[PDB]
Design an enzyme around this catalytic site. Sequence first.
Site, PDB file in Angstrom:
ATOM      1  N   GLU A  51      45.539 -14.725  66.682  1.00  0.00           N
ATOM      2  CA  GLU A  51      45.917 -13.299  66.490  1.00  0.00           C
ATOM      3  C   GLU A  51      44.362 -12.746  67.355  1.00  0.00           C
ATOM      4  O   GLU A  51      44.887 -11.646  68.259  1.00  0.00           O
ATOM      5  CB  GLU A  51      46.120 -12.227  65.340  1.00  0.00           C
ATOM      6  CG  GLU A  51      47.457 -11.873  64.660  1.00  0.00           C
ATOM      7  CD  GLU A  51      47.132 -11.319  64.292  1.00  0.00           C
ATOM      8  OE1 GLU A  51      46.586 -10.678  64.058  1.00  0.00           O
ATOM      9  OE2 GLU A  51      48.023 -11.106  63.313  1.00  0.00           O
ATOM     10  N   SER A  96      58.067 -11.414  60.329  1.00  0.00           N
ATOM     11  CA  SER A  96      58.015 -11.999  61.530  1.00  0.00           C
ATOM     12  C   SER A  96      57.232 -11.151  62.087  1.00  0.00           C
ATOM     13  O   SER A  96      57.494 -10.516  62.892  1.00  0.00           O
ATOM     14  CB  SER A  96      58.828 -12.603  61.694  1.00  0.00           C
ATOM     15  OG  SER A  96      58.688 -13.936  61.965  1.00  0.00           O
ATOM     16  N   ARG A  97      56.073 -11.292  61.786  1.00  0.00           N
ATOM     17  CA  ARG A  97      55.128 -10.973  63.258  1.00  0.00           C
ATOM     18  C   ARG A  97      55.081 -11.811  64.765  1.00  0.00           C
ATOM     19  O   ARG A  97      54.781 -10.578  65.277  1.00  0.00           O
ATOM     20  CB  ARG A  97      53.214 -10.943  62.692  1.00  0.00           C
ATOM     21  CG  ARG A  97      53.036 -10.177  61.294  1.00  0.00           C
ATOM     22  CD  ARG A  97      51.985 -10.680  60.926  1.00  0.00           C
ATOM     23  NE  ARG A  97      51.083 -10.836  60.950  1.00  0.00           N
ATOM     24  CZ  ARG A  97      49.945 -10.152  60.422  1.00  0.00           C
ATOM     25  NH1 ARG A  97      50.266  -9.521  59.232  1.00  0.00           N
ATOM     26  NH2 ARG A  97      48.534 -10.024  60.441  1.00  0.00           N
ATOM     27  N   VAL A  98      55.468 -12.241  64.596  1.00  0.00           N
ATOM     28  CA  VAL A  98      55.198 -13.254  65.819  1.00  0.00           C
ATOM     29  C   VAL A  98      57.161 -13.005  66.942  1.00  0.00           C
ATOM     30  O   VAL A  98      56.739 -12.331  68.000  1.00  0.00           O
ATOM     31  CB  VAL A  98      55.620 -14.065  65.476  1.00  0.00           C
ATOM     32  CG1 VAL A  98      56.111 -15.150  66.931  1.00  0.00           C
ATOM     33  CG2 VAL A  98      53.940 -15.300  66.205  1.00  0.00           C
TER      34      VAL A  98
END
Lengths: 56, 478, 126, 470, 121, 121
Positions: free
Chosen positions: D194, B341-343
């Site tokens: 992003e 989960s990049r967040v």
Amino acid sequence: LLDAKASEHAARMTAMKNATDNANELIRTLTLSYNRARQAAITQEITEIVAGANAL
Amino acid sequence: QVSDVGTVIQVGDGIARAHGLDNVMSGELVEFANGVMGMALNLEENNVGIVILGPYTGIKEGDEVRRTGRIMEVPVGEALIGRVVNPLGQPVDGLGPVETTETRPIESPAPGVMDRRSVHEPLQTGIKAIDALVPIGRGQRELIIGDRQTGAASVAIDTIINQKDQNMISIYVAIGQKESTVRTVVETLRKHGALDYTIVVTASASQPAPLLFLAPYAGVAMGEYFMYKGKHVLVVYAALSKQAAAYRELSLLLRRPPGREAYPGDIFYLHSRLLERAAKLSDAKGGGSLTALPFVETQAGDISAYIPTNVISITDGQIFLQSDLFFSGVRPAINAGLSVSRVGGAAQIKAMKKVAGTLRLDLAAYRELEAFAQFGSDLDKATQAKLARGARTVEVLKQDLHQPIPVEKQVLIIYALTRGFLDDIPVEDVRRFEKEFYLFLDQNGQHLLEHIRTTKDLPNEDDLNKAIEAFKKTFVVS
Amino acid sequence: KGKHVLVVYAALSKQAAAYRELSLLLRRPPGREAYPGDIFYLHSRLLERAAKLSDAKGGGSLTALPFVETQAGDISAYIPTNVISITDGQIFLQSDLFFSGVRPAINAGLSVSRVGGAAQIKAMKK
Amino acid sequence: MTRGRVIQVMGPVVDVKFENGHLPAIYNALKIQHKARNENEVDIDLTLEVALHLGDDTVRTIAMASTDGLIRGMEVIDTGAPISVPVGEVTLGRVFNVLGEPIDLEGDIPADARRDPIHRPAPKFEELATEVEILETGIKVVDLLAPYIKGGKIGLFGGAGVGKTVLIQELIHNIAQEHGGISVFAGVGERTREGNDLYHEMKDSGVISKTAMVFGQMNEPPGARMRVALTGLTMAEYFRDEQGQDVLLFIDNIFRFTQAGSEVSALLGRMPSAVGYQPTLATEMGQLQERITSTAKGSITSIQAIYVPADDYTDPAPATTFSHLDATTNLERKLAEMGIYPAVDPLASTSRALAPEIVGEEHYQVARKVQQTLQRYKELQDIIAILGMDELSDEDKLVVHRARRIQFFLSQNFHVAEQFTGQPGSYVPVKETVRGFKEILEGKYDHLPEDAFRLVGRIEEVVEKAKAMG
Amino acid sequence: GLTMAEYFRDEQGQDVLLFIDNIFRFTQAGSEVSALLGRMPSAVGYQPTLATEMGQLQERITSTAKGSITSIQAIYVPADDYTDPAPATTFSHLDATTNLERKLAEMGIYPAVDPLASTSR
Amino acid sequence: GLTMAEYFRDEQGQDVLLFIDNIFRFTQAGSEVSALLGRMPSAVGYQPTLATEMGQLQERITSTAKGSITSIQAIYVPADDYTDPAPATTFSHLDATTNLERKLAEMGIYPAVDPLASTSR
């Protein structure tokens, strides 16, 4: 007895090291063949689909 | 000059070609002679490829086709809460009609890159494993990928129910599910009492392909209203794969050129256009948010397929479910090894942030040494300690169904496990230990619970240690 | 005219890619790996002009040294097979020894010059 | 005449008809502006680009936005030239979409500004530079092991949460400060949030005062997702030519550019190539890359992020990209976990400039020595982690000592990280860093603690810090 | 067969069984007829309408208030490839799974149902 | 070549040896010309009429009542794929197989033929 036990442990060392190395060597070639097979399958499927569409 | 009328030429498989309709716009709504609705996709030089939105057996060649002039639109409003609705906007559960007084087009531009703000608030799912390891923050689009019979709908239902106290409004979109499963899901939601703040959109497998193709867009368009009014929305799709299948079938029927796996050229465009409308608006726009949890099913764990690959590339992270672990009995069988989960990091409260890292490293260390457990010849001080710790942590991470856990109790138990206080309890009694600890905390831990609730921070370590020592003393080993 | 010539094609692989793109644009049906069946003739027609004429014709010559780009050192690919069938012999270069800065491995295991051997002077043959 | 009308709409692909003998040339742009004449219509404003001539005075075009609401019969206006984009100093510090219209809220560019075509023939043979040059970036690892070539392409691997944005910012800032060269960022197929976070980060760090950004979001049609890279490149070409200064060009993702190309080709209807990609993949890549060169009075150097599909290095798109690359840098999770920045791999990374004919025999020998020492340390680590340093001989203990010192010295402080640390950063010249590395190799500074090699840069700062703790 | 069963489900209002020997043959017949009908091919040559027609067949097998139809559909996919579109489509409707084993059959127990491989929702 | 040999077979009544250089090139040329003719391709893009073309060729090489003709045919397989349609078709008409070995050749034997992999009907 102690000499024999130490030598046994050394033999197991070498045998297992060789086993792991052979496993990795097999793995790399298996992955290469897998990639070639996947590419061939997808390209043949696409060719079949497009030929079937153009045939009409 | 026929301008708003046209005649049918061909019929079949939900596809109709009409002659005329010269003033129609692409993506418009068209009404047939007997009342069946239709949307025009292709505009050729002499025929208008129409897609039928209902039972098409009643249309014969030569039927009259009328124009409406309205771009595809769905009813929306506050009256939809607690109803089951097909994508067209009609109720399928009886209980009278709806009172929606405003409609919006299903195709709208996504919020611009200058109207978005970094995600900074947590989304409490109530599942210990995901909440500790792969957190989800409001405004994030996270993908839950797993094989068949792996509790995907289970996780969806728990995270829908767990939002009872918060301000979230949740929307459940059913694509290609059996009507029986949809009915049971509605009934369990009603029994848990979540129907007072949720909307269910259904497109069964028996419905024609365009309805399956339209369901996600209808759901998102319904959500965007509460977006722009300033609330927080959570939406869930079950089958992006089935929606892609329906769209592929429609395009193939309309004689559009095919691509990979016979999919049309714009399937990635379709999925991206659907998912990119989920973001966290800036403060100038009101502060709304919409998080999406699409589901994708893989056969025998083949994530190499076209649709799973595209959805993975689009979304912000994966949550992997393991068929082997589910069969073994692990619930919910989260494969924390591959999930990402990049967040995450900024999506967790400080209290959970101060504790998650140690547990994460413990799991990472234990995961690679699972083969050591067959033999006791293990080096005891390090390796056997890691094995015992990993078994205890896994046993803690197991959970039952439809019982969300509040975040304070989650962080309490995680802290207790991390600080080594559970190395003595036998691994076959940890579940009973956990339940009894929750009971004891409800008994006299209300001060720590209130502090955690009101500060998002860990309580005083001395008092916490004293309380857990008291509970450990009062516990009985079985 | 009667002189001696050396010609070094660079990337027959990229030439084959260009021809494949041209064929697929001209709406012809592909074959293995989307290559049209004419690729072997395309390569043979080119390479077959490299020959040593007789003394009666003029005594000329023309030698060629085409290159081919492989992926992961796989000789099994279609274009490598076609070119290795057409050519007299191949000289393989090994990628792993290129890291050590050596001139890349002239791998004597796969390298072969079937036509050669008669070309070497006796001094080096010894 | 310029007026033309629509006759066919199929999703993103639209068809136009013109009066005979007035057809627009290929790659031109068509503007559609319409007002809702009544309530059964919707206002439309759309820009198309011409792709194919189907004969019969008809043209096959593709769309750059949503095609909903289109009616067969709308007037179409021909611009007579490909898409035009403003160039000059006005572009700096702004964010544009594919068509050159600002996305931010700073205001619209005045109409009198000079504009340039997107599509352009590659520079001729004559104008190219006759020799190779080395781009001195001031980051010790890259100018030591994997140097960057003026006018070359550089591949950059690595996932999320590794410092890729930080490295980008540091490169931009150093290049600007030490060469007076602007930089341009082109987000092909980025995630919207992003991109927003990257913009905020750059604005806060203050780098954005000397850069221009072009964003193509993932929700845009394949036409825009193909043309964003070209519009960024034509933004940079003006600075290369008129200003005569070295420029930096980034591309967020090139695999997505290839994928968009494949999708638009499938929509056009050509038969797919090997793995379903467009037949024209090679020539499209060539027409993109061939304009990033180094001429007699400027240069353009490109840093492109590559995502490998299904982790297959023989896939057609990665193969085609790698046919052009000159160097490669790899970013590693492990180096990230250790207190080392920029966490670039010192072994996986490689270059073409690493040759004595380019960098010099002394630099080459120092680099090779560092490479082999680090490799030997990596070999010994596995046995040492289980056996302890006791079994290590004196020579291998010295090797491990020097390898730890070297690996820690590879790190550097950044002007970017000042906002979170306070260290004023450093810009380490190539000669100084190679001399320092050779001296550390010679063993002169083996008595210092390893932590004195942490975040200094120049070799003098090492001894000053070591004296600082004493 | 299904419309034979539905009458007893709705008028008699009693539980009714239903066996289908091989639905793979059913989807194969659909695939065969589609090509001559003239529709374009799909993933592995199947019809585009595969999912919708299979759903239309299956969705009439349910349980209403006054009755029910429960079905026992046998599956045998040649070449043992569970990733094929027809098995993948049909597995989305299954509610159980039973495995008969020649191992237990030769051991000498009936009905020789595998106790481990068998699953259930 | 075949029709040049058939005259001597059927007129002089004497045994005739026919050497064909590489039979795979024959079907390769057939495949190349079929696409230009306009017939749709086959499994791997070969011509549809591969089997009957090869049959029409090979079936003229037979022994008769007044002489015989025997052929020695070299074989080459693309990408060493022994399941390719051309080798799969041509392997049906063979009666004997001989294999040459560089090991025996370099050892010094000079029939250079492996005595173990050489089979026959």
